[PDB]
Ligand binder design. Structure first.
Ligand SMILES: Nc1ncnc2c1ncn2[C@@H]1O[C@H](CO)[C@@H](O)[C@H]1O
Ligand SMILES: Nc1ncnc2c1ncn2[C@@H]1O[C@H](CO)[C@@H](O)[C@H]1O
Ligand SMILES: CN1CCOc2cc(C(=O)O)ccc21
Ligand SMILES: CN1CCOc2cc(C(=O)O)ccc21
Ligand SMILES: O=C(NCO)c1ccccc1
Ligand SMILES: O=C(NCO)c1ccccc1
Ligand SMILES: [K+]
Ligand SMILES: [K+]
Lengths: 330, 330
């Protein structure tokens, strides 16, 4: 036995969520469906134009850890907030879900990261992220005992944006692999992939990453191709296990020459896609750490992702474990 | 040609919202369906026990102002926040709805008020409010020109808990009445009524308040009776216009010997009752300041209340003006 099923590492962020029309995105030069990095000045400008909003703890990896705990697995999280109200909210929400979270704030400034997320009528989400305190995450925040005692350590491609987070991840990869654990990453966002293409490919080919999560767009961006079949063949060659999502088209899990196709669950209405990929990872990694088949892992991922897209906010407000039990996935 | 239809005055609060079971309330000695005042230590304690949460700008009168603006009316708000992130959230949300909000924070401590709101399976809401910076609201926060130029100034019975807010209200009553405007209050909460019964009756009988809002429980509390018919007779005698809500049983508007009953809208499913009374007042006061019949004011109130209880959070995220137009209430 160990202490954690899944440790995740990411940018600790509080989400500020509002609905908008398509024209708002155009007028403000926000790239639709993407993660748009912004500075403090731009954060003030955008907020000044944003409608009344709702706040909810976010962070891709944070959502994933919360999701694993929700399903009934044991999760931990590394991510850096500030000693401010947003940081206190973030700390509370993740710990209240039963996720181990012990990353200590270093002061009040820069303030806790936030992302202004604009949800259009089609349920698509466009994020505008000021990293704030996230730029302070470094090797000093690695709890070596946690990495050593976690079955999987999972991290965001998004961590390549802040300056020193990657040093923490390399330390994690070493510790995890010396203790016979597995490393996982998500490609995060197609533009993120574009910024760090060579570095991501090296993480996979050097074996620092064992399990890779991607959506169609990210897989296409990784190999700079319009040919999805090429992207699948290439990704299977570069990592031990790849889990590739295709929105309403479900997912495909790849391992060597094996391919496992899973359907998306039936949806009432696409309310807000925020957190879909994160929760697919929750479902998958929970399944994986419970010794379930790759196909069943995919099924648990699709169930979790389908639930989260039918609510506002990135972390399911309902029991995923109960949903799994009812769906016959247990 | 005046500047505002409705000025509201209340405790400026950010809500921290979570689901719980009935037993959570019993175990923590939280009075179900009530506003429970709490100190800083208890706020820390309750939060430590609360599950993952959502944040949304609240404050009864704040919600009411936002509602009036959403309907298409001209609103203003007085309420005191701190110079902190919660205060920034509050300031943004109310101003973004198009409500005039210019109350200046006085510093960072006490911090901005928050209410931990626990929603049970039945959709009932139990609030646990730390007043924080609200204790600093006083006469110095009265924008005299705003009161003078508002058709109605509406305020919370809740304002009787902090120490100096009542002085600001008396000042408002003088300015409003000297400029031929009307004053309105909500009785807020049945326990609040119990704390300030004599004072509230005085506000009505002295004519400092022209229009009173109440639910069944508050009206019963005000006259310390189990007889609702007696409560209706007495309240009609004590104020010029009374608007009494009865949840699923609709509302009754009283003026002298006149009574106007209004049906409640048929709900799909009650999600969260937070804000129902606040938005009834939005609808009523929007109608009233547009010169609409008392019945039509009640209709607009019930419409707004019906919408807000079908969502999480106290301020409708959908267009009330569009809903009113579709309803022929225009
Ligand atoms: N740069 C970023 N790094 C990590 N997570 C992010 C970033 N920008 C937005 N997010 C998170 O992505 C989540 C949705 O996948 C949101 O909850 C949001 O907080
Ligand atoms: N003491 C209080 N004064 C004014 N409003 C309050 C108080 N406690 C809770 N509320 C607000 O009541 C609203 C619901 O009517 C919530 O949005 C919450 O913020
Ligand atoms: C998704 N998007 C983000 C940033 O730039 C991109 C480049 C390519 C490509 O080079 O083929 C492909 C996709 C892509
Ligand atoms: C409002 N509610 C809660 C607090 O105290 C109350 C007292 C009475 C009463 O005195 O009859 C009636 C109701 C009541
Ligand atoms: O610390 C807070 N407020 C002022 O000290 C706080 C903490 C968590 C959530 C909201 C506010
Ligand atoms: O002030 C803010 N952040 C830096 O502390 C702020 C303002 C509004 C909403 C969230 C954070
Ligand atoms: K969502
Ligand atoms: K509500």
């Amino acid at each position: 036995m160990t202490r954690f099923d899944v440790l995740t590492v990411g940018n600790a962020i509080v989400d500020i969520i509002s609905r908008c029309n398509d024209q708002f995105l155009i007028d403000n030069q926000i790239t639709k469906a993407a993660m748009n990095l912004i500075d403090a000045e731009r954060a003030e400008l955008l907020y000044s134009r944003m409608g009344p909003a709702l706040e909810a703890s976010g962070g891709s990896a944070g959502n994933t850890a919360a999701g694993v705990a929700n399903l009934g697995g044991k999760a931990a999280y590394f991510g850096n907030v500030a000693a401010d109200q947003l940081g206190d909210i973030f700390t509370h929400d993740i710990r209240a879900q039963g996720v181990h979270y012990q990353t200590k704030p270093k002061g009040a400034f820069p303030p806790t990261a936030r992302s202004m997320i604009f949800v259009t009528e089609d349920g698509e989400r466009s994020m505008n992220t000021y990293l704030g305190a996230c730029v302070e995450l470094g090797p000093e925040d690695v709890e070596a005992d946690v990495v050593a005692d976690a079955k999987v350590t999972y991290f965001e491609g998004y961590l390549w944006d802040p300056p020193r987070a990657k040093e923490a991840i390399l330390d994690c990869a070493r510790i995890a692999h010396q203790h016979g654990r597995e490393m996982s990453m998500t490609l995060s966002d197609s533009f993120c992939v574009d910024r760090y293409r060579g570095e991501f490919l090296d993480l996979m080919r050097s074996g620092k990453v064992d399990i890779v999560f991607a959506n169609r767009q990210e897989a296409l961006s990784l190999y700079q191709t319009d040919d999805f079949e090429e992207a699948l063949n290439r990704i299977a060659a570069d990592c031990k296990i790849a889990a590739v999502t295709m929105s309403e088209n479900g997912a495909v899990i790849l391992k060597g020459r094996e391919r496992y196709y899973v359907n998306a669950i039936r949806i009432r209405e696409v309310v807000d896609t925020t957190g879909a990929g994160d929760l697919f990872a929750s479902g998958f990694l929970y399944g994986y750490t419970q010794g379930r088949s790759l196909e069943d892992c995919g099924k648990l991922g699709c169930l979790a992702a389908g639930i989260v897209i039918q609510q506002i906010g990135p972390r399911p407000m309902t029991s995923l474990s109960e949903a799994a039990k009812q769906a016959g996935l247990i």
